[PDB]
Write a protein that binds this DNA or RNA. Structure first.
Lengths: 159, 185, 51, 58, 222, 171
RNA sequence: AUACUGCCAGCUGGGACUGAGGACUGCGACGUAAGUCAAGGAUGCUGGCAUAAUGGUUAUAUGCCGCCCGUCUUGAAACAC
RNA sequence: AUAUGUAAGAAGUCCUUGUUACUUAAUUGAACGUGGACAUUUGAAUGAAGAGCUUUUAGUGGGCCAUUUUUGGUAAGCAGAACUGGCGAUGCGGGAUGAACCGAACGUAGAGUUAAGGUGCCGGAAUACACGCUCAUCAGACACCACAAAAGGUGUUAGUU
RNA sequence: CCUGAAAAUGGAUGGCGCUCAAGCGUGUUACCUAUACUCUACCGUCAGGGUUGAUAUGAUGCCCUGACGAGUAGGCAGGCG
């Protein structure tokens, strides 16, 4: 008979770590999550209450509720031909903030700084990001760097 | 061959040339098509599409609703334009001295308008006295307050008026609707 | 009613561009250049011809 | 008379016909499922805010 | 109101002034092209004389032609082709070179032939097959009036200005390229030059990045 | 088509830590510039820790033969892949150009060992002109002194399908 | 100078298919201005018969192609009905 | 590696904390908000063929076949899964012939160019051009594909010592 | 290339036939043609539009522009009898 339990096929996924077993460091309990914060889900195998499902393992959501030792996270899950909004009551041990959102907020603050600078003098700030442009022309010297000619090597057993 | 992204030969999905065979409605549609084409008035365009509209999409608007629209600030002297039927409300005891333009008027509604002192006018008189819809206020009736829409979207945990014929005890008030009988919806 | 392609029908070409007229007048499609003798490097030729 | 048991063939195509478009988001999401203590406090705070705003712009 | 003498004179004077400014702009563009090419040549010669190597700047524009049919194509390359507006065989589009567009081209490598076009082939394509996307309709360019009416906010007032933006990709290259309807090229007049198309151009096939041979290929196809 | 001799010199992408990389150069026979750059990157990947994304090509110049109108023997050291393993071999051919020399080398490889340009690496091509240095009889037999020979059984191609006298193979 | 490559809004020649379309218009070119143009789709001139000549229909012949329809079926021309 | 979750702003970013029965030792925080400042780079690329939304209903609920991943099996034109593309439902050009392969998808005509496949004749197109190799008293001849192995042969050809 | 290498009606590199090939491996390059691509005409569908100057066109009228066209089960529309 087939087996599809709550923690089915979660052996290595919920495997704790290598040389990171045991108690958890208290930074995780010290972190503060407010409503609207984007957070990453990585289940902790040593904590068994508030554990997320293996589907939500590795997903990212928005905090919508805060409780004593937990946080309500909203995840859009693809069910068939649409995403449904699932609400999870996860614990702070399993939950973790989003460096991507932190970086975006830092970029927003910087962007505002450059716009203020432009309003100060207007030096064509170009707020937006640009992709990797093709490299322009350059002149490379040969003094001290005379080209060393290479040739394909003959085959040898090397055993 | 072409790798099509959208569906080929797709109709507009909107209504034009209304299904009604009313020659007078056709005359009004012709007049307002001309007005919308040669005037550039968004009022003319919206009145044209409201003329195109169907019946359940043209709910009756009550004289009480018109009175509320006039009680809106700075709207006492605006010509109240409805594309549909204006019904008489017996729950109001006062009416102002507005002008109401509409496709149809019930006897009680028209009597209320003319007794309050205003004028009931048709869409052609509205066009002749306000080609650009100057100082007009368009009224719309509640489309989503009918039996069909209250039945629409029925399913578990929606609460959408199950399609039933006999209402009362022992008519779909049992297992699947209370915890004492199996589950609750 | 009918598309007339430039690069033929000099009338349409001139309608879209009068610099076509001045380009033809000055023969800029075959334009000479002033000669200057900037000789390359002996190390350059030796690297090119290196075995 | 055995038959095919299960397959996911054609399923993604059927989904993507008119499918995986994102759900629509709203300002002021539903306050259901949030802490009822916070709900009571937010109700009272909103009532007070409305009263104070009306007093400010009488 | 006769609308025979005064209106005609005003319209013709405006047209003559617009033609004069278009001519001045085209002369400036030709001078810029010639200066850029000659400067490249003298930069290479100066590097050779100084003992250093002049590395060519990587080309900022490619022309990409979908050359495979519309059957049996996986979803990701199909979507990338649709995003690049390559929905038919022998269908071409100009692409600005960035990391994102290079990744797109690498994704759709086995179905397109792309390369680095020159001013000659760009002008050939625009003049011979130039169609604007106006009100979601493919109308032929055929008129600096049309191009100015649909792109005058960006200063593009003629086919020469449009071509200049395309070749020297600038601030409004995205708008000009999107205004340009995708080019519907014919099959090459002399053939593809290879017995089998669907190998890489390096491997003796036809698809992939033929860097500067796209000019010859697109001139044969156009 | 007919191969062309290219020198392709390129480096790794100059970083802040190590500016001005070592500028490696290669001589390669390829159809044109695109295949030349492809083969240069392939060989430089086989030899050194660098790929096309992590490096750049600073120069690619065609090399014409110094004298394309004099006969010289050519010693070609190549390595190729068979259906079983990899083998190195040395061939000698009489030819007027290095490009035509590798043309005949590739043709002879394909003819005699079914090896394709895919499977063949040209390790080295050396121009020589000394007798008693060439080791192949099928070259020394032409480098013999006062070499003259006839061409027996001459066959003349005809344009028309019908000829009105029996052909003569004299010469 | 010349295998080569690239460009020409460079110059000439020989073929083919097509001719869609309107009661004033548009965009243009051409000697210091009259107005003409290859510029928003073919006109000019000249021949043969004032008919089964061109054609339509039909029956053969010829070149190539063409499995018997309906159904069940993953699959029918089926030695499946 | 390939796949895969997020974010790339106006429902946003900064001073007034205005309300609270929540919370704090505390006008401390939390949530919501009033006043003010931010334009043609409103905060990457590309595209968008009009976004979005509702009702109602048909047929279907025997599938099969490539290329890759892969299970049982000696194996199977066997049985069973994953992604994608196809056939079913689809003609057309090529593989002589063939549901799936290769090209390419289809209104009625004309001209031109090709794809895949080909150019001795059947059969439209070089009894082309160039270099080699092969002589079989069962040659070899173009994927899917319509089969062949270990072993051996100074047959012949080409390759370190 | 040859030996290994044996199955039953007569038989299939598709056949004829082919031996410095019309075989095998690899390179130029010309050439042939699909209902595919380009351009043009016509038909239909869809979309976007223009039109209240005569006392002539039910404005379901007239006109302009562009894109598209496979199809079983099935749906709808417009028509014939």
């Amino acid at each position: 008979g087939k087996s599809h339990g709550y923690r089915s096929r979660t052996r290595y996924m919920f495997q704790r770590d290598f040389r990171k077993h045991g108690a958890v460091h208290l930074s995780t309990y010290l972190k503060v999550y407010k409503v609207g914060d984007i957070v990453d889900i990585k289940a902790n195998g040593s904590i068994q209450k508030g554990m997320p499902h293996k589907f939500y393992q590795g997903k990212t959501g928005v905090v919508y509720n805060v409780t004593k030792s937990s946080v309500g996270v909203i995840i859009n899950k693809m069910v068939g031909n649409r995403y449904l909004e699932k609400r999870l009551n996860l614990r702070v041990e399993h939950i973790k903030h989003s460096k991507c959102r932190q970086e975006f907020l830092e970029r927003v603050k910087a962007n505002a700084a450059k716009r203020a600078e432009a309003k100060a003098q207007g030096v064509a700030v170009q707020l937006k990001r640009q992709p990797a442009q093709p490299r322009e022309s350059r002149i490379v010297s040969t003094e001290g760097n005379v080209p060393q000619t290479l040739a394909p090597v003959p085959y040898e057993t090397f055993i | 061959g072409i790798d099509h992204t959208s569906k080929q030969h797709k109709r507009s999905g909107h209504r034009t040339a209304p299904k009604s065979d009313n020659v007078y409605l056709k005359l009004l549609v012709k007049l307002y098509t001309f007005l919308a084409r040669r005037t550039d008035a968004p009022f003319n365009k919206v009145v044209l599409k409201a003329l195109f509209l169907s019946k359940i999409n043209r709910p009756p608007v009550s004289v009480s609703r018109i009175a509320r629209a006039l009680k809106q600030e700075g709207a006492a002297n605006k010509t109240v334009v409805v594309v549909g039927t204006v019904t008489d409300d017996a729950r109001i005891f006062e009416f102002p001295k507005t002008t109401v333009a509409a496709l149809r008027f019930t006897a009680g509604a028209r009597a209320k308008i003319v007794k309050a002192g205003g004028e009931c006018i048709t869409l052609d008189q509205l066009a002749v006295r306000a080609p650009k819809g100057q100082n007009t206020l368009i009224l719309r009736g509640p489309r989503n307050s009918r039996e069909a829409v209250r039945h629409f979207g029925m399913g578990p945990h929606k609460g959408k008026a199950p399609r039933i014929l006999s209402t009362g005890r022992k008519f779909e008030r049992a297992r699947g609707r209370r915890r004492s009988k199996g589950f609750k919806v | 009613v009918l598309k007339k392609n430039p690069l033929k029908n000099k009338q349409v070409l001139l309608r879209l561009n009068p610099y076509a007229k001045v380009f033809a007048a000055e023969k800029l499609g075959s334009k000479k250049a002033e000669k200057t003798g900037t000789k390359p490097a002996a190390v350059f030729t030796e690297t090119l011809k290196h075995d | 008379a055995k038959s095919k048991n299960h397959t996911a063939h054609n399923q993604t195509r059927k989904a993507h016909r008119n499918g995986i478009k994102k759900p629509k988001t709203y300002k002021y999401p539903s306050l259901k499922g949030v802490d009822p203590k916070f709900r009571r406090n937010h109700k009272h705070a909103l009532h007070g805010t409305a009263k104070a705003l009306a007093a400010a712009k009488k | 109101a006769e609308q025979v003498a005064a209106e005609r004179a005003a319209r013709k004077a405006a047209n003559k002034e617009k033609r004069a400014i278009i001519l001045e702009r085209n002369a400036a563009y030709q001078k810029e092209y010639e200066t850029a090419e000659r400067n490249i040549i003298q930069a290479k010669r100066d590097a050779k004389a100084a003992g250093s190597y002049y590395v060519e700047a990587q080309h900022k524009l490619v022309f990409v032609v979908r050359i495979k049919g519309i059957n049996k194509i996986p979803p990701k390359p199909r979507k990338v082709l649709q995003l690049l507006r390559l929905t038919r065989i022998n269908s071409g589009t100009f692409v600005k070179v960035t990391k994102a567009t290079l990744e797109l081209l690498k994704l759709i490598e086995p179905y397109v032939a792309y390369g680095y076009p020159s001013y000659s082939t760009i002008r050939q394509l625009v003049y011979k097959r130039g169609f604007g996307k106006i009100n979601k309709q493919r109308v032929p360019l055929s008129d600096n009036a049309i191009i100015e009416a649909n792109l005058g906010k960006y200063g593009i007032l003629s086919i020469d200005d449009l071509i200049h933006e395309i070749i020297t990709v600038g601030p409004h290259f995205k708008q000009a390229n999107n205004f340009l309807w995708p080019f519907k090229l014919s099959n090459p007049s002399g053939g593809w030059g290879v017995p089998r198309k669907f190998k890489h151009f390096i491997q003796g096939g036809s698809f992939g990045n033929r860097e500067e041979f796209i000019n010859k290929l697109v001139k044969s196809m156009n | 088509a007919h191969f062309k001799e290219y020198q392709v010199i390129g480096r790794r992408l100059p970083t802040e830590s190590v500016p001005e990389p070592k500028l490696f150069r290669m001589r390669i026979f390829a159809s044109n510039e695109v295949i030349a750059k492809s083969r240069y990157w392939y060989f430089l990947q086989k030899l050194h820790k660098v790929k096309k994304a992590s490096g750049e090509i600073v120069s690619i110049n065609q090399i014409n033969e110094a004298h394309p109108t004099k006969v010289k023997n050519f010693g070609v050291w190549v390595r190729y892949d068979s259906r079983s393993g990899t083998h190195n071999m040395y061939k000698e051919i009489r030819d007027v150009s290095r490009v035509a020399a590798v043309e005949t080398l590739y043709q002879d490889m394909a003819a005699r060992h079914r090896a394709r340009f895919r499977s063949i690496h040209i390790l080295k091509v050396a121009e020589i002109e000394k007798t008693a240095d060439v080791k192949r009889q099928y070259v020394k037999q032409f480098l013999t002194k006062d070499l003259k020979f006839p061409l027996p059984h001459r066959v003349q191609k005809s344009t028309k399908t019908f000829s009105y006298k029996r052909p003569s193979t004299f010469y």
